[PDB]
Amino acid sequence: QALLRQHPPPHQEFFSELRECAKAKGFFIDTRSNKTLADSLDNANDPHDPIVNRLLRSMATQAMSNALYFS
RNA sequence: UUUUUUUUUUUUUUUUUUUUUUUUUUCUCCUCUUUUUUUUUUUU
């Protein structure tokens, strides 16, 4: 008896086009764990432009799952 | 030196009654365009 808040893991398909565009300018990423997701993200820092990080994490933020309550 | 007479303002009053807002039409009718539908997160 309580009420908790979950984020069940995502699946590859919202990542597919993401990976595509990562596979368009340089960056190699992989999808096996939120640890290595976040790591292989935060390193990629395109030198001659600022928008890249914002934009990439924002399409990443169009990918993922939901947060809903349960007893 | 000029007398006498020719009516006037309809009579009547001591009758019972058990309803009720309104009121009566007008037909079927092509909604145009990046999408699956996004979604955690924190500061109110």
Backbone angles phi, psi at A34, to 5 degrees: -55, -30
- Distance from C-alpha of A64 to C-alpha of A9, rounded to nearest angstrom: 8
- Distance from C-alpha of A3 to C-alpha of A32, rounded to nearest angstrom: 29
How many CB atoms are located within 10 Å of the residue A56 CB? 19
Question: Does nucleic acid strand B have an atom less than 7 angstroms from the CB of A23?
Answer: no
Q: Where are the alpha helices (DSSP H) in A1-71?
A: 12-22, 34-42, 51-61
Method by which this entry was solved: cryo-EM
- Distance from C-alpha of A12 to C-alpha of A42, rounded to nearest angstrom: 20
Question: Does nucleic acid strand B have an atom less than 7 angstroms from the CB of A64?
Answer: yes
Question: Does nucleic acid strand B have an atom less than 7 angstroms from the CB of A13?
Answer: no
Query: Closest nucleotide to residue A7 (Cα to C1')?
Result: B40
Resolution of the model in angstroms: 7.0
